[model samples]
Target chain A: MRNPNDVFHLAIPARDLDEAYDFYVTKLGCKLARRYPDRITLDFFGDQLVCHLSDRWDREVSMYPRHFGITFRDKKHFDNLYKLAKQRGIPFYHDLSRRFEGLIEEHETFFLIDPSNNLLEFKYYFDDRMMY
Target chain B: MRNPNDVFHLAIPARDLDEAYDFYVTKLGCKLARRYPDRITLDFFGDQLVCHLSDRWDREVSMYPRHFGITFRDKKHFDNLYKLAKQRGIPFYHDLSRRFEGLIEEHETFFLIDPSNNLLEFKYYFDDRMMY
Candidate 1:
């Protein structure tokens, strides 16, 4: 069980629950915490994520300035995730790249487009100050 | 400064930066952390939120499960936010409601839709054991 005060919960739309199970569970390696007929909860990087089936979703996606995910504190932890995604052939919206290079916020980043068009960015910022 | 390991950042689309400023800052009362020509960042209930101007955005939005926000440890915190919303006429997708009643996870919840169609929920769970 996670510490009650430590968990951050977020809910997002998913077009299909089975596909969510496949991608989030089988591929992304999130622990399935709970499930309903139309929704499934996952332990998303020490946070909580509920993906609920919805009829109305964009079906298309965006990457620039609109996405959600975790920023790794440990570079090795980030590299491991990157390697896992590559090995699993997860759908990549944007391949691994560095943004704001030679700047305070210089960091490695990548984007993954889920089955539901939710673009997720997994990144590691070298400067702790840039984590803001 | 917050521990980089402890922060979670989310970016969402906003049709107008001024409208974002008006709601997120003026009405809902999130602290503006940074501002650029096209985007503004907020210390959103102890998390990071960037509201960016985008011409291409869905003006219409959903509330069923596509929302994000915090779970207050104190009931007073949740009530105060609800009172503020009602007092300021913040656009509400759903008024105060309860779900999974008579269950361990029963919580008091409400949804606020920002000017840019992002749905946010603020809630308090009666049962601390059910915070997961």
Candidate 2:
């Protein structure tokens, strides 16, 4: 078995490192784990999310295929994040909505678009088994 | 504090379902947690990795600006995965190499390319504190 504490790491592009700090750390409440001239690391919902300073970021963003985020086992955490995002004026790619309604996999979800155009989705599954 | 067992979620493009299964499940040894016509869910190293079938997958792949993977806190797990990828003939984007040489952040890293042109990087740091 893998360590329960072992964090998943994701590296994405950031047009500006300071914007990354403002969004991920100041607004989203993720910890500023580290910072370098070329990159900034965030303790994103218990995972390691590194935003590299680069100009080659995606110009066109789509939600269907490529995105990264968290699946909250605790409904309260999910709700809290949603409220925080709304209050803080974070841009949403998609608002709160239920998916697979009336099915065993039904879940409430939303997406937030970062300054660099990276899409992040946060969701809470009604059926706990569907989380994995 | 968040639940240590809470899984991180990432959704990426997959050109074909069969190729996704062949690579992530068969070769990489990740569990097939769920499958649907539009997408497939993988238990990627204990986190949730979803491959959504899409025709808009990236044609050009780059390792520097955007990629996602695990930073193994356990060196044994990192080496084991390295051996498995070598023996299974996984297409590598970047071969095993040392980075930040002679610095406290030095680490051994490699990159793998998926069928959909998504890049996955795996690394183990010499200093365990850098795993975060």
Candidate 3:
């Protein structure tokens, strides 16, 4: 069977739903979609980020750090996001570089951390024809 | 914006890549896609299952159990999976029920444990109209 899509939603645990919502919306520019006392959903571009405030989850797992990657449509979008991160004084894990040439040439990308310390990398290609 | 999809790939640490590979392929019917000495990728239908055989990971987190849900297209698929589980003497945590009627009515579902002790639930809808 063909793959449904390249990405999907991720459910993460937050100690406080409202606090998490405020952090994501106020700091990260993520839009809040739905909310409940114990849970809230945010739109991370097109991905659903569900933050569940539950004491049942082990604190160790809840606090575990993960690194993920994201792609943008063009260099302009990537530059805009990178400038915004720089303006907000967000630390970058790596500087942009040309690593995947020919296929994804003239790309600009960088990494940033979320409120929960999860590492995320944002990238963009020079041409739309390269995207599948 | 819309959701990218409903699921994503999860990376789990395994003590032995071959052991984990055999367990998933032989026991769970997952197709092996790529293999390496330290890592292997399995096709869990469409989502990628990356197993990293790394000693650097904390054993506690590596052994942690997680509960996730999966949806099938019909009752026959669900029944086939359930029958295989029964043949292998697998134990279930919960039985099938009509919990989400009208919205997801006439669905047959059950839960099973993977080789890593991660909990997985398989479900099927009665009609194609219910799926998005």
**Model 3: residue A39 alpha-carbon error in angstroms:** 2.1
Stretches > 4 Å off in candidate 3: A1-10, A22-34, A42-49, A55-112, A119-132, B1-7, B54-110, B121-132
Show where candidate 1 strays beyond 4 Å.
A1-6, B1-4
List per-candidate RMSD values in Å. Answer: 3.3, 1.7, 6.4
iRMSD (Å), candidate 2: 2.2
Tell how far residue A23 is off in model 3, in angstroms.
5.3
lDDT of 2 by residue, A34-76 (tens): 7899999888887789999999888998777889999888899
Considering every candidate listed, which one attains the maximal lDDT? 2
Better of 2 and 3 by lDDT: 2
Error of 3 at A104 (Å): 13
TM-score of chain A of 1: 0.92
The docking quality of candidate 1, as DockQ, is: 0.37
Backbone clash pairs for candidate 3 read none
Q: Which ranges of candidate 2 are over 4 A from the true structure?
A: none
lDDT of all predictions: 0.78, 0.87, 0.56
Q: Top model by TM-score, which number?
A: 2
Q: How would you order the candidates by DockQ, starting with the best?
A: 2, 1, 3
